[PDB]
Design a protein around this ligand. Structure first.
Ligand SMILES: [N]S(=O)(=O)[C][C][C]C1234B567B89%10B%11%12%13B85%14B%1158B%12%11%15B9%13%12B%1061B%12%112C5%153([C][C][C]S([N])(=O)=O)B%14784
Ligand SMILES: [Zn+2]
Length: 257
C-alpha cells in the first residue's frame, strides 16, 4: 500500500495509479511572474457560517476534520467555479522540518505545511461521483509558515494526542473553519488533480496567496502523529507531501495584480 516512504512514496504511485503521469497532475510550482492576472476572475465566495464539523480522523496519510455535507451549509462558490461546492473535510500536509511540507510551491519556495479544504460539486450529488468528473472537486489550499500561533488552529492541535495512530477518530463538533483563513482571498487557480491516490484529475485548485502563521508548538504536535497503526513500529507522520509535478499544457491564473 501507498505512502510517503522510500519504497511506497510518490515516485512509486504511478504503478497502482497510472494517471500519476497524466496531463493535469497536482501539486505544481506556482511561478508568480508567469501566472497571468485574469481580471474576469470573480472573488471567491466562502460561506462557512453554518458549517457542522463532525469528527477528526487519522487516516494513515494525514489527519482530517470531516463536515456534514448532506446540505449546503459550508460552501465555496464564485472565483473560477461554476456552481456550488460543499465542504467535505480539511486536512494538512507537513514536513519533518519547517523548510518543507507544502505540496504547492511558490517560485520554488516550500512552506512548513499546507491546509486543504476539500469541496465537491453539488451537481454530481456525492463525492464518489464528483471525483470521476473534470470539474468535480474544488480544493482551497492555504500555506502555513512558522511564526506567531494561529488561535483558531489550537482546538485541532489539542486533540491530536487522541488520534495518534492510523484509524483512530474522535468527536470534533463545533469547529469553525473560518478561524483558519488568512485576511485576503487573493488566489491562483489551475486545473489539476488529487495529490493523493487515486490522483484523479477532478480538481479546480484555488491556492491562496497569503499564508497563515502557525507556531512551532502547533506544528510540532502535527509531527507527533504516526503513519502506523497502534502496535506496529512507530513511524512519525511527517513529510506527507507530494512534490511538484510537471505543469505541461496548463496556465496558472491569478485573481490579483
Ligand atoms: N484512495 S485512498 O487511499 O482511499 C485515499 C482517498 C483520498 C480522498 B477521498 B475523496 B476526497 B476524499 B478526500 B479527496 B478525494 B478521495 B481524495 C481525499 C484526500 C485529499 C486529496 S487532496 N490532497 O486534497 O488532493 B479523501
Ligand atoms: Zn491534501
Amino acid at each position: 500500500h501507498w505512502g510517503y516512504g522510500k519504497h511506497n512514496g510518490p515516485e512509486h504511485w504511478h504503478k497502482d495509479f497510472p494517471i500519476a503521469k497524466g496531463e493535469r497532475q497536482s501539486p505544481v510550482d506556482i511561478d508568480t511572474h508567469t501566472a497571468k492576472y485574469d481580471p474576469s476572475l470573480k472573488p471567491l465566495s466562502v460561506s462557512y457560517d453554518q458549517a457542522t464539523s463532525l469528527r477528526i480522523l487519522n487516516n494513515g496519510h494525514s489527519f482530517q476534520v470531516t463536515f456534514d455535507d448532506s446540505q449546503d451549509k459550508a460552501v465555496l462558490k464564485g472565483g473560477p467555479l461554476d456552481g456550488t461546492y460543499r465542504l467535505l473535510q480539511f486536512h494538512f500536509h507537513w514536513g519533518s522540518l519547517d523548510g518543507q511540507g507544502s505540496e504547492h510551491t511558490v517560485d520554488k519556495k516550500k512552506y512548513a505545511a499546507e491546509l486543504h479544504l476539500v469541496h465537491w460539486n453539488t451537481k454530481y450529488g456525492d463525492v464518489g461521483k464528483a471525483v470521476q468528473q473534470p470539474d468535480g472537486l474544488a480544493v482551497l489550499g492555504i500555506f502555513l509558515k512558522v511564526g506567531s500561533a494561529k488561535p483558531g488552529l489550537q482546538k485541532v492541535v489539542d486533540v491530536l494526542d487522541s488520534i495518534k495512530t492510523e484509524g483512530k477518530s474522535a468527536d470534533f463538533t463545533n469547529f469553525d473553519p473560518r478561524g483558519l483563513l488568512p485576511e485576503s482571498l487573493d488566489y491562483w487557480t489551475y486545473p489539476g488533480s488529487l495529490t493523493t491516490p487515486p490522483l484523479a484529475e477532478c480538481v479546480t485548485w484555488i491556492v491562496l496567496k497569503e499564508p497563515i502563521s502557525v507556531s512551532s508548538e502547533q506544528v510540532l504536535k502535527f509531527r507527533k502523529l504516526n503513519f502506523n497503526g497502534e502496535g506496529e513500529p512507530e513511524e512519525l507522520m511527517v513529510d506527507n507531501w507530494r512534490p511538484a509535478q510537471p505543469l505541461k499544457n496548463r496556465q496558472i491564473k491569478a485573481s490579483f495584480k
